[PDB]
Design a protein around this nucleic acid. Structure first.
Ligand SMILES: [Mg+2]
Ligand SMILES: [Mg+2]
Ligand SMILES: [Mg+2]
Ligand SMILES: [Mg+2]
Ligand SMILES: [Mg+2]
Ligand SMILES: [Mg+2]
Ligand SMILES: [Mg+2]
Ligand SMILES: [Mg+2]
Ligand SMILES: [Mg+2]
Ligand SMILES: [Mg+2]
Ligand SMILES: [Mg+2]
Ligand SMILES: [Mg+2]
Ligand SMILES: [Mg+2]
Ligand SMILES: [Mg+2]
Ligand SMILES: [Zn+2]
Lengths: 143, 130, 78, 132, 283
RNA sequence: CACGGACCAAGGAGUCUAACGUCUAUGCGAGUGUUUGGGUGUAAAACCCAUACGCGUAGGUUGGGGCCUCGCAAGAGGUGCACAAUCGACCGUGAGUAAGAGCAUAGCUGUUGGGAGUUCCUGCCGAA
RNA sequence: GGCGCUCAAGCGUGUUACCUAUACUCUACCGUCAGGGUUGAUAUGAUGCCCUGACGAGUAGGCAGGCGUGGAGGUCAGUGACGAAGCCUAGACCGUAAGGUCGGGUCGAACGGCCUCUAGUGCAGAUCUUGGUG
């Protein structure tokens, strides 16, 4: 109170806007392969592990397969393909949002590779990048 | 007669009034706290009134009451606000006890601004002395 | 074609891009009427003021902390 | 009709301000009626003579009522006996004022009536004949 | 609304003798009538004006002379004067020298107004400058005298000061520019004679068939009357004075379930019952 | 595009005033207007007196805004402005009376008149 | 309309799709109107502030509000060789606009702002005339 209020302070009206947990798109499910459309790893195929509280999807390359480390990715900048891997092998509880502010990636990668081996040619798929060739129309293209 | 005086001053020549481009009016009256010609503003319009006004280094408080409406020479009672800002606000509230909130709020604001102006003119005119 | 529908909003009317309503000022006494309304109003020295008076007005305006719209006019060009 | 008196008289405007405030803040329709009357032009404010006041009081039960005339009251030498009452009106001619004072009555402005009867209790409004 | 005014000696010391106010100062102050009459009469230097209206305007101006706030409003430096209406000893009427009268005015406290009028002198702006109207200056104090004993000659030369007999007061001299409240100084004899000239409650005005005007409103201040004590008893409770906004925006019931339930409670139950998709019996 | 074009500079198609009336504001009020003259006057002025004449004066009942009582309210009533409705009396069959409003000033403005092209900007109301 | 068109880019007859206006709906804004709230006083002129709603084409006709030009009274203890008034200003700011303020230029001695009453807004075209030039 060391200064009397010069002019006046207009208090903001109370806001009836409570934040609620996000409702993700139906295609996104744990163990779903993803295509990243921007950033350092744009056009690179990655695996989906879990959805964080702050609405940043968590993804692993695996770094072993394609050199993409554990990372947070925005959901809207990602395409979801119809091919899946079982994520039950990897537990994915410890690492969280605040944690993001090598050994863990190795632990995750061993379990995820274990499931990757069963499906044919999946490692090659995750290794290679994606791009649009001439004559490719996305709207028909089933991803 | 304050209402009559105000109505004449409003719909006739308030010589201290200046019509700004926006349409808002400013009374030039030195004693005026809020330099805007309104019902609550013209010291001429209102019998009960107060202002902070600077004389030399001091920031005096001038009081106006209907009792001294006659004898305008002695009308404005002069009170010295203490240099301590907190003490000054306390003295203003005490003297303006049971006094309409408009003049009290405006008086406090004017005291704050005049104190800042005194500080900053001390700033602009700092000299080698002391 | 001019018409009333083009009228500007009242809250934004008569406002410079700096956000200060322009008020004409002739002398120090008229400057002092804008002592606290520094946020709402900015002073503008009249065209007919002499150079000797303009420096005094500018000094008093700086002391009061009131924005002058046209400083360095007739003390500098453009 | 009007929303404010066309006259530029300061005192009429003050009375209009008081009565519009009362009509806004009083349930009684009396304040509304007098407020609407205050706006009227001279032709629509015919003079109500002391004669009409005498008739209005002769009506049964109205002897002690405060007669109200939004306008001017004029004397009438036709009468010799005039009862005592506290007429209220905007203006009073010298003859009418003398007649009211002489008979023990008294004349008040409409502000004094508002102080007396903010809800217009026991009031009797009169209006002059606007034949032409 | 004082009872009396204190005379002031020429040297400045307050005089014990006191004079009751005349009834003119408690007269209607009407800017509109004064303005109309002032325009009509200033056109002459012709427009006919009712004599009673002219006297009414004169009375209104005289009443305005006592309201110091209006005098400040017009521009006079009445900030430093012993009191208002300003009264001075009758000996003022017998001064023979301009310098003595000016010194008496300094003692009276009208020094500031005279200094203003002196400083205000400037050359006439328009071509009227060469039509015998060349120098223009502000107006000074008015000195009213009941009888002239050489005061008139002394104060003629000093700029800004005009003298007028009590029996002959002028609206032009009293209200320059249709603006009420000129600064005036009344001689002690003049203050007394004002009653005879204009009349009091129980005294004939000395003008044939003239009475001072009555007030349409008995009280000048409407704030006192509107507040009062009994009206507030008569008045219903007040509002907020800043209306609360209701229904700033329209929320369609069909798209927002909350307002839909608000409009209709039975909609909740009907949704659970699904009567809209009810099956009529096959029969 | 269809239709026309010596050249530069200029100048470039009539006036004051009256009569009646509606409305508005102000002053007074069965009154109202002064100035027809005089006094007075820091002097056409301003202030004031008469002097005349002008234009004015010479009930029954129902409804009724309003106010009183009862009623929380709807209502129950009581009382009744203006004015209307019909019912009549009298004066002298209406402009009727049986409890008048006008005069003066100013503004705007309709009509009749006495010789008598477009129209600064914005807005508003609006036939057919 | 122009370029162009002839299983039409010509007609009449039906089908959808599509483009979009001074039209309609919603929102915000600006104006006029209407209904309101607000004083033992308002955090800014109760002619203020605030709330709510309706309308904005409009021909004939009529009314209001602003801008600008002079005249007079009053006023700003206004402005001025450290540069007043006048004029220009493809500069800046303001106003929907008539315009206003400032900057600069020009100018070189006085004039402006504001309240009131009083006068008073820019163009077109003809008969031609005169000088001057063919
Ligand atoms: Mg310039
Ligand atoms: Mg009439
Ligand atoms: Mg009866
Ligand atoms: Mg409040
Ligand atoms: Mg809305
Ligand atoms: Mg009857
Ligand atoms: Mg009846
Ligand atoms: Mg569209
Ligand atoms: Mg507010
Ligand atoms: Mg409508
Ligand atoms: Mg229309
Ligand atoms: Mg002038
Ligand atoms: Mg220009
Ligand atoms: Mg713009
Ligand atoms: Zn003021």
């Amino acid at each position: 109170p060391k200064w009397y209020p010069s002019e006046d302070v207009a208090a903001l009206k109370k806001t009836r806007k409570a934040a609620r947990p996000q409702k993700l798109r139906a295609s996104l499910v744990p163990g779903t392969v993803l295509i990243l459309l921007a950033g350092r790893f744009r056009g690179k195929r990655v695996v989906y592990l879990k959805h964080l509280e702050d609405n940043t999807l968590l993804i692993s390359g695996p770094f072993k397969v394609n050199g993409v480390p554990l990372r947070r990715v925005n959901a809207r900048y990602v395409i979801a393909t119809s091919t899946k891997v079982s994520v039950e092998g990897v537990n994915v509880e410890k690492f969280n949002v605040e944690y993001f502010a090598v050994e863990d990636q190795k632990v995750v990668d061993k379990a995820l590779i274990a499931e990757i081996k069963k499906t044919p040619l999946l490692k090659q798929y995750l290794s290679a990048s994606f791009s649009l060739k001439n004559g490719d129309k996305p709207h028909m293209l089933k991803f | 007669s304050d209402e009559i005086v105000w109505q004449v001053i409003n719909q006739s020549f308030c010589s201290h009034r200046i019509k700004a481009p926006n349409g808002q009016n400013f009374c030039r009256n030195e004693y005026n706290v809020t330099g805007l010609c309104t019902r609550q503003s013209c010291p001429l319009a209102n019998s009960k009134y107060a202002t902070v006004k600077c004389d030399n280094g001091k920031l005096y408080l001038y009081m106006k009451t209907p009792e001294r409406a006659h004898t305008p020479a002695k009308l404005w009672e002069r009170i010295k606000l203490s240099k301590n800002y907190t003490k000054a606000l306390q003295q203003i509230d005490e003297h303006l006890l049971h006094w309409s909130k408009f003049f009290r709020h405006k008086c406090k604001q004017r005291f704050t601004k005049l104190t800042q102006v005194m500080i900053t003119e001390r700033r602009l005119a700092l000299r080698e002395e002391e | 074609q001019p018409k009333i529908g083009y009228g500007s909003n009242k809250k934004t009317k008569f406002l410079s891009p700096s956000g200060h309503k322009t008020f004409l000022v002739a002398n120090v006494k008229d400057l002092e009427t804008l002592t606290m309304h520094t946020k709402t109003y900015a002073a503008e020295i009249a065209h007919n003021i002499s150079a000797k008076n303009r420096v005094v007005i500018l000094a008093r305006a700086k002391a009061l902390g009131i924005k002058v719209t046209n400083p360095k006019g007739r003390l500098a060009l453009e | 009709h009007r929303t404010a008196p066309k006259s530029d008289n300061v005192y009429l405007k003050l009375l209009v301000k008081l009565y519009t405030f009362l009509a806004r803040r009083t349930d009684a329709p009396f304040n509304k009626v007098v407020l609407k009357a205050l706006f009227l032009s001279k032709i629509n404010r015919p003079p109500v003579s002391v004669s009409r006041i005498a008739r209005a009081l002769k009506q049964e039960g109205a002897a002690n009522k405060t007669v109200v005339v939004v306008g001017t009251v004029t004397d009438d030498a036709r009468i010799f006996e005039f009862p005592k009452t506290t007429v209220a009106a905007l203006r009073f001619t010298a003859g009418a004022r003398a007649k009211i004072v002489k008979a023990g009555g008294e004349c008040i402005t409409l502000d004094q009536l508002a102080v007396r009867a903010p809800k217009g209790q026991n009031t009797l409004i009169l209006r002059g004949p606007r034949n032409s | 609304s004082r009872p009396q005014v204190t005379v002031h000696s020429l040297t400045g010391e307050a005089t014990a003798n006191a004079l009751p106010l005349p009834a003119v100062f408690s007269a209607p102050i009407r800017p509109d009538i004064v303005h109309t009459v002032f325009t009509s009469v200033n056109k002459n230097k012709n427009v006919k004006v009712n004599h009673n209206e002219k006297r009414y305007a004169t009375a209104s101006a005289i009443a305005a002379t006592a309201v110091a706030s209006l005098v400040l409003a017009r521009g006079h430096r009445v900030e430093k004067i012993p009191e208002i209406p300003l009264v001075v000893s009758t000996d003022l009427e017998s001064i023979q020298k301009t310098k003595e009268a000016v010194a008496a005015l300094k003692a009276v406290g009208a020094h500031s107004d005279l200094l203003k009028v002196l400083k205000s002198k400037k050359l006439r702006a328009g071509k009227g400058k060469y039509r015998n109207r060349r120098w223009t200056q502000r107006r000074g104090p008015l000195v009213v005298y009941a009888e002239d004993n050489g005061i008139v000659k002394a104060l003629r030369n000093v700029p800004g000061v005009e003298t007028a007999n009590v029996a002959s007061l002028n609206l032009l001299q009293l209200a320059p520019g249709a603006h009420l409240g000129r600064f005036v100084i009344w001689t002690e004899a003049a203050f007394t004679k004002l009653d005879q000239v204009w009349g009091s409650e129980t005294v004939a005005s000395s003008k044939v068939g003239y009475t001072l005007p009555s007030h349409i409103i008995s009280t000048s201040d409407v704030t006192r009357i509107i507040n009062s004590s009994e009206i507030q008893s008569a008045i219903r409770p007040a509002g907020q004075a800043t209306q609360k906004r209701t229904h700033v925006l329209k929320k369609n019931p069909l798209k927002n379930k909350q307002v839909l339930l608000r409009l209709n409670p039975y909609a909740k139950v009907f949704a659970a019952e699904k009567l809209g998709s009810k099956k009529a019996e096959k029969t």
